Amino acid sequence: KYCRFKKSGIKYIDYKDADFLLKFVNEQGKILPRRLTGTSLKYQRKVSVAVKRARHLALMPYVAD
């Protein structure tokens, strides 16, 4: 129930990795709540805006299944 970004030394969230951005998304392409992943709020905001940036850049789908 810890933060995978506070445990490691990662300070940025890249959006050009569709394979890496699949760990914070639902099975149908929805952002997972930070309660299930233990991520702090400061990094949850960043991962949410990164997911949205990937959706805009057409690396992750809006409506998936």
Added chain:
RNA sequence: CCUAGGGUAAAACUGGUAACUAGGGCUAAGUCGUAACAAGGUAGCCGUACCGGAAGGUGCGGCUGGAACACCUCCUUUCU
């Protein structure tokens, strides 16, 4: 020359009164409806706009000074 008094002109303050007219408090509790008090039978109230014999109704925003119900779809992590 000065100045009491008198005349004249336009204003300011204030009192009384007036056809008609708006609202307020009581009287015997007359006529019409039941708007609020229980979730008052459409939750209530506040600001505002429109409308209607009347209490009032509706649109937008805000509050609980409202009752009854009221824990969860994903289970766990590697420098991307």
